[PDB]
Write a protein that binds this ligand. Sequence first.
Ligand code: HEM
Ligand code: HEM
Ligand code: HEM
Ligand code: HEM
Lengths: 144, 145, 141, 141
Amino acid sequence: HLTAEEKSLVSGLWAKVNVDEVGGEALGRLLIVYPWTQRFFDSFGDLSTPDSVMSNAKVKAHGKKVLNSFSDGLKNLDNLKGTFAKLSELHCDKLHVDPENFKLLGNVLVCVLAHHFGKEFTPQVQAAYQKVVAGVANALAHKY
Amino acid sequence: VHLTAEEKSLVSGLWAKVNVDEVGGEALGRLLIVYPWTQRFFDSFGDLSTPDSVMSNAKVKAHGKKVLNSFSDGLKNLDNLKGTFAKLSELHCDKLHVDPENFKLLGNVLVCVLAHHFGKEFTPQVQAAYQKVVAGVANALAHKY
Amino acid sequence: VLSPADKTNIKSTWDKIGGHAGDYGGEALDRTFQSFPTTKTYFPHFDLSPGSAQVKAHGKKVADALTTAVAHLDDLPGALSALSDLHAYKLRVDPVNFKLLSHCLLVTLACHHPTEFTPAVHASLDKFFTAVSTVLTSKYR
Amino acid sequence: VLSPADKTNIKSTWDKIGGHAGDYGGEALDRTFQSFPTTKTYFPHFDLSPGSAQVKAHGKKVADALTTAVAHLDDLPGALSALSDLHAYKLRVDPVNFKLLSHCLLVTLACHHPTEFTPAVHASLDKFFTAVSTVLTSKYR
Ligand code: HEM
Ligand code: HEM
Ligand code: HEM
Ligand code: HEM
């Protein structure tokens, strides 16, 4: 339930997203800011400091998958349930990630967009992006 | 991700024995006491200023019974919790502005009251089944936004 | 904070539990694992089947820790420091899960001690389990 | 626990925001209200339209409390005691809302100080706002 204005606010900014970096930054920050989230990422090698998190090649590559997945979500805002259904079962049934962490990651993503865009990440833009991440987090959590 | 047949049996067997006059107000009462910010929603209910006023509050009891009954409606339609709670979800979200986290808190407090009332009969298994119910009710209530 | 009444409620409750605490910890785990299966994933090394000796044994540890905490309500951080290290640094337990176990501990106490489990004691016990949880996740803050 | 590093991060960040703090408090509220509109319901007495003077004036009050907290990182409970009472006892603010506002504070800060908003400082600021929220919700525990 984003408005048309909100759709173009989101798309407007998203087109400017550094797709190679932003996902990794958001994931790195999640891992740093909420350290229990590292439990899911033992195969990722060194996450022992912020600097290793932020230089972790796999965090960067996987963060890029997470970002593309968001992009996926932005192209299917009228069907996030379907778009995220298998990832929902992945996260819930294989990975056992508590859904609260989807919200945190969404919000860290928002922090990273704010960081990257500054004044352009207006309260309105953020508002639109908050619906997207809520929609994504809810779509991901909809498999329990 | 719903209840097994066995769990549905567990839930309805206990539910039949729930004191419909008391369990609702006791859960709502303990919610208001355990999570005092929830009183913000109940300014019209009069004295909630002590556990004793909460627990002897007639409007807490009467409302809790409506709440319990809405849970019974849920238990009578476990495969259509979305439909059963649509109107209530709009009420709570759009009109009451109750954060959905509190639906989960209330469901868990209800589980506590069920434990309290049934004791050993409220087995880990009966509990697990009830946790699905209250999560399902909370989720159905949350479905608005 | 934990008021005199809170501490009174916690202590009198723990006293009523008396020698059942260990069993109750096992029951609380059992309740957690059944109600919130995702919590089982922290114990892949445990046999989680009914009657599990590991679950029983671990419930005593959890109960012991809680009993230690009851004895040190004015210093949960010191009393539980090793355990905060463990749960945050070693186990990396999602803070979410402490709510779940805390919930099942309340349920377990309500199941066994209907008389003690007044709204006021419920609230004090809640505060208690939340305070224990805060400390056990304190190495995330 | 705010570590020396956290405290340094928080303080240098606050040094950096300087005379903007008030405006950022208002932006943070604006962001909260827009992103999480249920938060508006705590301010039925406020004009919440764009450029609201009440929101601006209130963001300044919120800013000032955070600025005070930043001066008293050792003793947030003591610094924010009056405000704990206000928020729990008078306002009955749902704990969830502190997380929303805290998030919006972080966002506001990230919007204005990209350079300062490193992962570590983000973590420290997060811990800061959560520590303030904890104190502001302490009369619930
Ligand atoms: C809420 C937004 C999230 C989105 C959109 C998302 C997306 C994804 C995607 C698309 C994949 C598959 C990547 C691929 O192979 O193509 C994945 C896997 C994974 N996710 Fe997420 N995720 C989210 C949240 C989380 C959180 C919060 C955690 C942990 C706290 C997490 C943990 C994992 C792990 C451990 C994997 C497997 C990574 C690997 O071993 O390669 N996810 N996620
Ligand atoms: C989670 C499961 C819940 C269920 C099944 C439920 C059920 C209901 C029902 C059926 C009504 C309308 C009663 C009537 O027609 O008179 C109602 C109203 C109301 N609910 Fe809920 N409720 C739940 C949770 C909550 C929570 C957590 C809160 C706040 C903490 C809340 C606050 C209210 C308030 C303030 C009213 C209006 C009461 C009045 O002024 O008469 N509810 N609820
Ligand atoms: C909230 C109150 C809790 C208390 C008082 C507590 C207490 C303890 C204690 C005392 C130990 C050490 C046992 C030993 O030395 O053998 C322990 C370990 C452990 N804890 Fe907790 N814990 C709590 C919460 C949790 C939660 C919420 C989880 C995750 C769902 C958890 C997961 C674990 C695991 C996986 C171990 C290792 C057990 C073993 O390998 O034997 N704990 N806990
Ligand atoms: C960072 C956390 C927060 C801080 C530092 C803070 C600070 C303050 C301060 C200093 C006041 C007194 C203003 C005055 O005396 O004029 C106040 C009042 C108030 N607060 Fe908060 N607050 C926080 C969180 C919240 C949240 C999360 C809400 C609800 C969403 C909230 C709702 C209110 C309301 C409704 C008032 C009365 C304001 C007025 O009538 O002018 N506060 N807050």
